[PDB]
Amino acid sequence: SGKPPVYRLPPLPRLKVKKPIIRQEANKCLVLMSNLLQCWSSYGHMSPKCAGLVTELKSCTSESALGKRNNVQKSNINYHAARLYDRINGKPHD
């Protein structure tokens, strides 16, 4: 019934985000390291099971330290905001 009210904004020069948080994924070659360290701590350093994780690190490290890095996108929310702010703002007419 009595939900919190909606607060508008005074007219603004523009609507944008300073540093948008764009989605990104880890290499998982560091994750492989994290799992291998867990195996070393629990099973023992270079223990048999850790060896499988050891080889996984070898595969992820051979060519690049962080492995192959791709899927590095950027968020275009600033573009859309600047595109349709003039319509979405609900400013009074002239």
Binding site: A26, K28, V31, S34, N35, Q38
Partner: protein, 184 residues
């Protein structure tokens, strides 16, 4: 048909109000001026809207039936609402409302309620007949060697399977990511 710009003078009403007090002097409302009301855009209202709300909140699944809003030609519409079934339009809640309006206009019935129930029962009868007709038509086709590729159930199952398979991939990936997070 309400009239804008009319003020009921104290002399107009001699009888006591609901609380038994005789009105002898104008009140605060009468003092104020009402130019804004003259220039304000009128608020359009129809009795049919109450019935339309009542119907669709009494027959929720009637909303499931799609309704086309693109008018064909509203001017060229000759409807005798003694029988709601009418060529050129479907059988829908609007048929009930128009029939109720016709019943009251002719004064065959009394208040909103009776005419509404009468039209409603007619609408039930026509809908039951149509549903049975569809079921029997289906039976006709299969009895006579009719081939069916994909039914509604299997169409739904197939689309659901596509979504589930995508979900399966996502959840396994999320699980290993969560293993990554907790392994820290």
């Amino acid at each position: 048909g309400h009239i804008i710009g009319k003020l009921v003078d104290v002399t107009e009403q001699p009888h006591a109000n609901n609380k038994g007090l005789y009105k002898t002097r104008p009140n605060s409302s009468d003092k104020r001026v009402g130019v804004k009301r003259l220039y304000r855009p009128p608020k359009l209202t129809y009795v049919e809207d109450r019935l339309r709300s009542l119907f669709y909140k009494q027959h929720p699944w009637e909303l499931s039936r799609p309704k086309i809003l693109v008018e064909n030609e509203i001017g060229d519409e000759n409807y005798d609402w003694s029988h709601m079934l009418q060529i050129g339009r479907p059988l829908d809640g609007e048929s009930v409302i128009q029939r109720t309006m016709y019943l009251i206009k002719t004064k065959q019935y009394g208040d909103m309620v009776e005419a509404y129930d009468h039209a409603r029962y007619e609408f039930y009868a026509l809908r039951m007949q149509e549903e049975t007709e569809q079921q029997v038509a289906l039976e006709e086709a299969e009895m006579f060697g009719s081939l069916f590729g994909v039914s509604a159930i299997e169409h739904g199952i197939q689309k659901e399977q596509e979504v589930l398979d995508v979900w399966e991939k996502k959840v396994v990936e999320e699980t290993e990511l969560m293993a990554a997070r907790t392994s820290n």
